[PDB]
């Protein structure tokens, strides 16, 4: 099955399902079976097992409800969390931003459901993007109980507020990934063409359906989505990321008219460069799964232009070098590392955590000793992918102390990803550093975040553009990489 993780073949799962079917644990190999399989072989698996299924137990067991049917009741049974964290750590929230960190709490602490139903007006006192984060928080508390999800989110569906129903459909997309029954009421209309509600419902519904999902009908419905070209960034954000998560793990990628269409319409208008920042995210997501693809040279011939689409080119260079023995790209990395452009250093040098993710002995380097603080952010993000040994925390000792709110804000993120009784001590160190608002909301985000799959590699690589308006914070809370 590891050979199926590295091969991405359709016959291996059939031979291992008839050989594992003959040799009758069961729910455990189903759980990490679904964890090990990518987006391709579970839909090919659901079509060949939609044909035979050999017991009715291959789509009965290995399609949905059974990667979470063993965990959730046992997680509620074997674990007993205290209420003093909700009380104190759930009581020092204020200033309309620690309340956003409290939507992070509500969404990402679900045994106990007290803070979930702690009265009302908690979503009314919040802001628009906090109304998305709180409308989707009740979707993050319901990764189980499919029948309960409809009767808990139904109160927020088609309500009087646009963000309550759009974030409610986002919740309907987060609660499940194989029900696919909530599509029609939101995917049906899709038509505003300027700026009505169904565009925010297109954010939560196209992104939620992207989390639920070579599907062609949803892409034909996504043709007027990219053709609309709304002024909002998260439209093409969740569109490119949605079709990318649909396209990750394909047969050596593709250069079809989907990403060719979003490249032509990408270069159509050179405004709001954040489009030129998050569209190459979904582009490189469609580049994932390659074994011998020449898409880096095809793009290196087709998007040679200003550093916007050249930044798209170096993003294709990032996702096109997942990792092999190609040290020529390491000396090329050192050669191009001194470029005057201060963003291709960030992403192209940020690829280090993805390229050498296995041989972590060479990952600690002298990148922190430079003067390009953005590179210190690169190593800071690259650290948070392991148990966090004394060397990594040693790097968090120097990286933890900085004056800029971007690095002081960025250090508790990787500090919380690297550690999911030495957890609360660096937090007290943050209390000694500060006692801005972003560092407090993010340090609470660490307080409750403490307690090669693409699903764990995409959300943070897309999250590398947090240094903008609070509009991104509507997508910051719905990251699916957090187990």
């Amino acid at each position: 099955l590891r050979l199926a993780l590295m091969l991405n073949d359709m016959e291996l799962v059939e031979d291992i399902f008839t050989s594992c079917k003959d040799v009758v644990m069961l729910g455990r190999h189903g759980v990490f079976l679904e964890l090990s399989e990518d987006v391709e072989e579970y839909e090919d698996l659901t079509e060949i097992m939609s044909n035979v299924q050999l017991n009715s137990n291959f789509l009965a067991l290995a399609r949905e409800l059974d990667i979470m049917e063993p965990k959730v009741p046992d997680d509620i049974y074997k674990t007993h969390l205290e209420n003093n964290r909700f009380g104190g750590s759930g009581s020092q929230v204020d200033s309309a931003r620690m309340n956003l960190a409290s939507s992070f709490v509500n969404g990402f602490v679900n045994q106990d459901k007290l803070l979930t139903d702690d009265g009302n007006k908690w979503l009314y006192k919040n802001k628009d993007h906090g109304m998305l984060s709180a409308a989707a928080s009740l979707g993050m508390i319901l990764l189980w109980d499919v029948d309960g999800g409809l009767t808990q989110i139904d109160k927020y569906l088609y309500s009087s507020e646009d963000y309550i129903k759009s974030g409610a459909l986002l919740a309907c997309g987060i609660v499940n990934s194989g029900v696919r029954n909530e599509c029609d009421p939101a995917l049906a209309l899709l038509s505003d063409y300027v700026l009505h509600n169904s565009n925010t419902m297109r954010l939560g519904s196209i992104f939620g359906l992207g989390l639920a999902y070579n599907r062609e009908d949803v892409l034909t419905l996504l043709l007027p989505v990219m053709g609309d070209s709304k002024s909002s960034m998260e439209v093409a954000g969740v569109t490119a990321l949605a079709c990318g998560m649909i396209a990750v793990g394909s047969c050596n990628g593709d250069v079809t008219s989907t990403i060719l269409q979003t490249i032509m319409e990408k270069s159509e208008t050179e405004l709001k460069d954040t489009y030129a920042r998050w569209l190459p995210l979904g582009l490189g997501l469609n580049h994932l799964g390659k074994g011998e693809a020449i898409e880096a040279i095809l793009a290196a011939l087709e998007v040679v232009s200003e550093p916007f689409r050249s930044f798209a080119n170096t993003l294709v260079d990032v996702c096109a070098y997942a990792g092999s023995g190609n040290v020529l790209k390491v000396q090329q990395l050192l050669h191009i590392c001194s470029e005057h452009f201060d963003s291709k250093e960030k992403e192209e040098d940020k690829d280090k955590k993805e390229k050498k993710d296995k041989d972590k002995k060479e990952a600690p380097a002298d990148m922190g000793a430079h003067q390009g603080v953005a590179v210190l952010g690169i190593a800071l993000i690259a650290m948070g992918e392991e148990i966090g040994a004394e060397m990594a925390l040693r790097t968090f000792g120097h990286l933890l102390r900085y004056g800029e709110p971007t690095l002081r804000r960025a250090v508790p993120l990787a500090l919380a990803l690297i550690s999911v009784s030495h957890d609360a001590d660096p937090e007290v160190s943050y209390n000694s550093i500060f006692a801005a608002r972003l560092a407090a909301m993010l340090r609470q985000l660490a307080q409750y975040h403490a307690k090669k799959g693409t699903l764990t590699l995409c959300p943070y690589h897309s999250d590398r553009q947090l240094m903008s308006q609070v509009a991104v914070a509507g997508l910051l809370t719905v990251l699916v990489s957090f187990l």
Binding site: S421, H422, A424, D425
Partner: protein, 212 residues
């Protein structure tokens, strides 16, 4: 021996075993005990601390060299061990080889500061501290009255049976002549935690390995 290990086990390992006699009987000895033995160095003291390592988090601190190896750091590392011991309330703090008194004027103020911080004037019972040394006469009586209030035990002369068994195991694969006796070896040596006879068996096995 289980006798002197059950009292320190229930003393410092308290909140992980039989939780119906600490608050129901109303005992609360949040001070622990102080160990001392003429051999000391942590052989039978570490043999008494190995029972805490079964199901708990352990912290091993041997000697006071890490305090007297800097210009003016002082008890800062002790404060780090006390804050990580505060964050590690369900753990066991074992301090061995307290021979700081046996320049010199700072030892008395970092030891009096160790007395002030070990007493917990503004803290409740959260972590237990174990003290161990070689000679109890060198330590000043300041660490006795505030420190030890629960129980103290005296340790007799070393045990030749355990050291003889360790030397027998380390010399089982080795080649020794008939004129090499054990009583003169275990008798001539003194004040060794076992890692020192292991050290002379490592340099003796390597010294015998030099001739192949």
């Amino acid at each position: 021996l289980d006798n002197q290990i059950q009292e320190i086990k229930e003393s410092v390992e308290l909140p992980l075993t039989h939780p119906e006699y600490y608050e129901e009987m109303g005992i609360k000895p949040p001070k622990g005990v102080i160990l001392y033995g003429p051999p000391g160095t942590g052989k039978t003291l570490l043999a008494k601390a190995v029972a805490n390592q079964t199901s708990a988090t352990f912290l091993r601190v041997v000697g006071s060299e890490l305090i007297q190896k800097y210009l003016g750091d002082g008890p800062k590392l002790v404060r780090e061990l006390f804050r990580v011991a505060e964050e590690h309330a369900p753990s066991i703090v074992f301090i061995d080889e307290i021979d700081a008194i046996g320049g010199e004027r700072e030892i008395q103020r970092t030891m009096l500061e160790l007395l002030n911080q070990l007493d917990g004037f503004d803290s409740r019972g959260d972590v237990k501290v174990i003290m161990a040394t070689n000679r109890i006469e060198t330590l000043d009586p300041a660490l006795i009255r505030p420190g030890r209030i629960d129980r103290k035990i005296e340790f007799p002369l070393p045990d030749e049976k355990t050291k003889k068994r360790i030397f027998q195991i380390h010399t089982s694969r080795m080649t020794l002549a008939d004129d090499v006796t054990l009583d003169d070896l275990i008798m001539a040596k003194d004040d060794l935690s076992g890692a020192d006879i292991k050290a002379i068996c490592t340099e003796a096995g390597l010294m015998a390995l030099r001739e192949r």
